[PDB]
Amino acid sequence: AKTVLRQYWDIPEGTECHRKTYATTSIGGAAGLVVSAYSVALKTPTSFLEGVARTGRYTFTAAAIGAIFGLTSCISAQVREKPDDPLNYLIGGCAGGLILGARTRSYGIGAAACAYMGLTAALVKMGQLEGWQVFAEP
Template identity: 40%
Template sequence: MGYFDEPDGKDCLGKTTLTTQVGTVIGLTSSMYAFLFKYGRMTAVQGLVQGTNITLTMAALGAVFGATTCAVSAARGKDSRLNYFIGGCTTGALLGVKTHSYAMGFGMCAGLGSLAAIYKHGVLEDWPNMFEEPKY
């Protein structure tokens, strides 16, 4: 199942599950690189704890984005860029809560919200997907 197989506001559980899985994979990958390059002098237990923290944070961010975007789409009854901005903004605000920083929350809200809205604009305008094979 792809994320855009169902219209926004439908199959919220499936979309939230998919974004959570993507967040988990990003978290596991980030954990690996953090352990190798940043936390290389940790013991295995310390590395496991730090990796779990990173992975769970990224999984939570994916879940919040998927759930918020789908819930806002269902409540508004519209498929628009604003739904994705609100989902990205909520995700950024969660990072601010995790870091106990209003500046981080506001900045990530604006950044992730804008990035998500631009992505949705690209989907609505049929911009080419950078992960697909080019068609000649």
């Protein structure tokens, strides 16, 4: 819901790293739930404990990356100089991608995991900084 994102950009601002990633793992904990729905309905009939889908553990991957997605911010946003900066929030992209590099082993998949995930992370706090809107109206 949009109450979750409303509870994201307001209070923590790098600080309160106990509840920073506690608000940030919920999106990562909910994100694997969507792909788990198609993995039993599009991928074929599974074992007798549905959901028993093909590879499984999709939530087990998604809840972990979303946990470190806020954690690597609130550590580094605390320790460097205490703003949230594009250089500061860049660091969460790399190691958070490498859980997908650690699982489903590397050198062809994990080698691009730090690559693409970091650049799309830094644009986000850049996106709120200049006043950009995705879905605007007159």
